[PDB]
Design a protein. Structure first.
Lengths: 62, 37, 47, 79, 151
């Protein structure tokens, strides 16, 4: 029924778009390593692993 | 491991398939009677 | 009423995570009772 | 019960096999998943039946669940 | 999907939904009317193979019973659609007006097959009468499919 085909084609298009969005950003991991780039991301990484270890209230007061 | 060339090909093919499918969707839309009643 | 009273206990004693851990439950029950009561009122109004 | 007299074991699913199974099972699970969601979004309070939804969802679960397993073994995150 | 967060119904959307359910039911019953005509045409082929009139007579009576039941259920559901004010009721009436002529053409086809097997109709005339009957049948079916799209 026409509604099924319209729904199918919407779902298929959007799931391909999602898979493409995720997959096109992997080039850097495939070429070298699953490691953090640039200078600024390292502060976000250190602070993130802090919050992941010490808990919110000790990160906020940190 | 998969190389960045095999990924580049895969992504090119996904892109082409996506845009061709959207250009099909516009036909499946305009042919609809209920969209224009 | 309990949902509005919880705000005094949060101001005096609780932290945020505890406050939300209570307010989730109390808002869920208040929402279910409000939806049922409002549907009844809507029928009575529209009758 | 001492070393040289005994036997040895390995997984009957051999090294070369996982790349096939993962693809097949995930393809099937994607089929039934698409069917499930198209059926759910199209059908309506008067037109749904529980037993069809349950069967489609159970089958899609079986196939997806084993496909992801063989996928993670293919990657080599051996459980 | 089973739960509903709703307060005020909109009976107009409920009518738009029940009408759609009933229209899918009617569409299925109509597809079974076409399938009963395919059963009957198969029964006519079996008749030509067998030259046994009882097969096709039982086919005719099973048609004029089950297709008649489908027509009655169609008209009762159409009475529901009429109560719902649906502009589709009178167009299911139009489809039944076309299908009554398709029915009389099927009866003519069965009569011409009975005459052919009885030798009352000659092959070179049977061929032309078949081509005309099935041609106007296919025309009526195309009209039917357009009116069903009009639902």
């Amino acid at each position: 029924s026409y509604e099924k085909q319209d729904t199918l084609l919407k779902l298929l298009i959007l799931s391909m778009a999602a898979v493409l969005s995720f997959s096109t950003r992997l080039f850097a991991v495939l070429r070298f390593e699953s490691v953090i780039h640039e200078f600024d991301p390292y502060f976000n990484y250190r602070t993130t692993r802090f919050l992941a270890e010490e808990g919110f209230y000790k990160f906020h007061n940190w | 491991m998969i190389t960045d060339v095999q990924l580049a090909i895969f992504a090119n093919m996904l892109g082409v398939s996506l845009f061709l499918l959207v250009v099909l969707y516009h036909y499946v839309a305009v042919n609809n009677p209920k969209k224009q009643e | 009423a309990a949902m509005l009273g919880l705000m005094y206990v949060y101001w005096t004693q609780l932290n945020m995570f505890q406050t939300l851990k209570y307010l989730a439950i109390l808002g869920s029950v208040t929402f279910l009772a409000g939806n049922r009561m409002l549907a009844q009122q809507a029928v009575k109004r529209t009758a | 019960m001492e070393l040289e007299a005994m036997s040895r074991y390995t997984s009957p699913v051999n090294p070369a096999v996982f790349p096939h199974l993962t693809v097949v099972l995930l393809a099937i699970g994607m089929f039934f998943t698409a069917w499930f969601f198209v059926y759910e979004v199209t059908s309506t309070k008067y037109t749904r039946d529980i037993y069809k939804e349950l069967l489609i969802s159970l089958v899609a679960s079986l196939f997806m669940g084993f496909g992801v397993l063989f996928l993670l073994l293919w990657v080599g995150i051996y459980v | 999907v089973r739960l509903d967060f709703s307060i005020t119904k909109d009976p107009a959307a409920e009518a738009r939904m029940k009408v759609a359910c009933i229209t899918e039911q009617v569409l299925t019953l109509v597809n079974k009317r076409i399938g009963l005509y395919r059963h009957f045409d198969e029964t006519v082929n079996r008749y030509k193979q067998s030259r046994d009139i009882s097969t096709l007579n039982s086919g005719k009576k099973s048609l004029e019973t089950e297709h008649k039941a489908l027509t009655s259920e169609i008209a009762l559901l159409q009475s529901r659609l009429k109560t719902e004010g649906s502009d589709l009721c009178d167009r299911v009436s139009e489809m039944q007006k076309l299908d009554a002529q398709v029915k009389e053409l099927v009866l003519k086809s069965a009569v011409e097959a009975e005459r052919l097997v009885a030798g009352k109709l000659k092959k070179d005339t049977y061929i032309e009468n078949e081509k005309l009957i099935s041609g106007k049948r296919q025309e009526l079916v195309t009209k039917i499919d357009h009116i069903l799209d009009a639902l």
